[PDB]
Amino acid sequence: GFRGVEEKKSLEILLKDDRLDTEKLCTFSQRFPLPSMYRALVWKVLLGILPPHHESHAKVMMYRKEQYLDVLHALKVVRFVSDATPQAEVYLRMYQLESGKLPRSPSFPLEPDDEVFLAIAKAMEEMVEDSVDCYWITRRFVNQLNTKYRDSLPQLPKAFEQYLNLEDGRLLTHLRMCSAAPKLPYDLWFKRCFAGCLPESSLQRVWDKVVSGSCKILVFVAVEILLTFKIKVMALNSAEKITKFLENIPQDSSDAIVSKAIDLWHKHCGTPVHSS
Template identity: 35%
Template sequence: MANEKGNFRLPYYEKCGFRGEEKKSLEIILKDKPLDKIKLQKFCVGFTVPAIYRNLVWKLLLEVIPVYTDSHEFVMEQRNLEYKELVRALQTMRIIDACTPKTHVFYAAWLLQSGRYSYEWTQPQQDDQFIMLAHVFLQHFDNEVDIYWLTKYLYEYIIKYKNDYPKLIDRLWSLLEKEDKELFLHLQHTGLQKAIPIGKWFDSCFAGILNENPLAKIWDKICGGSVKILIFVTIALLTIQRHELLKCTTLQAFLDCLKNISEETADLIAVKSIEMWQKHGSPKNVNANNNSNN
């Protein structure tokens, strides 16, 4: 009976990020002094980060905190002070108040910190990409200081790749044609191929499209240095929803088909996209200083 119970619980533990061997491997990496960022990136390329370590690993890979563990407490104290000063300044300027949604607070703080805030605005114009990224982090973590800095660094990391979008999207259509020619031709003939907002999906790393829990598996790869996985998430999304999408001839009908994707379906999309990415596009060699080809 004990073995049966263990087998029954195993899928649950794996879903929550408690796979034994992987967890132990990551714990060994996290004992290095200083921490080895390349090892962490390789782990993210090969495995799903256990949920209990995701906050730490993402902060390390996005450079919210340094690889020197002795400095973590001091650095986060400074991050905390800077964030609170930004919030205090925004409150003084009456840009935010107690009723302002946290995602909007984070965005206003980023505008102010990065020198993009205009004093002519009574309210900052919102950036959907930043807001959606922040929303996902809010579902995973409780500390708003962590969430602000993670959102800021992931946002700034992704926008560096906007010039690469045309190349990534060309690769996407080439692979989709091989993967599902019927669907590819349907999207082409209806004009949907050019209308689908793939750039916006890339901008938000599929926040607002896929459930936050399966999405974290994809973000592990992005934080590990591979923006290229967004190609395969798109292909998995389209092919798994193909039966409904083949009925669509307008953009609105197409977008309606992608609303309210269940967590179970989102999990299938995440698993398939990672499998395709590992087969076609995952980086063979991880370089902590140059991930542009990943």
């Protein structure tokens, strides 16, 4: 079955309209993966980097590029960044400047928020080719974590504890016998949004859903992580060993991890339905 063709053509129809319906684009992003050629466009549109009207994209990208170059040149002028500075750290400093949270000098150690943004920025670099697009996608994504999900993300660990049992109760019982449930890497999974845990070629399938309003996809991604590694987790026998394994999971099974996490999230939270 050529369902990939159906998905791509439906998205091209959603993108053909002179006004892009962000609600339909969100529902599509929930229900299907984004083709890689339209992922940056659709992420820009849902993150509000580009407005719904397609005509306005040229001028708004001029605005975004001007803002990016102005902030970057300013960081160069106050010597906060340099040409050697990694692109992710450049994005971190640009975000700090734009949010008014720039330190006095780059030698000031990173705050936890800074490391979280840096991790998401590193992951974005591999997903988005263009530096301006990558920076804007990164900043809007992290801002969604701090604004659209400031209350939802803290609930995610409990949702993990719930759905983990609901798919294999004995597995969560195995974890709680180790009393390792509060020591699982929730800051990685839900503040850094699996940046640095999954390869970006499949972390992007997660982030399609995170952009389109779903941070529970993160819960199900973690759940499918532990379901995929049942053979290993049921052989794990210590809280610290579990914590270290979960921060460095084998990356080979990650494509299937995210695919089955999306399947699980479509099974437990239902299939998205187009509005009438």
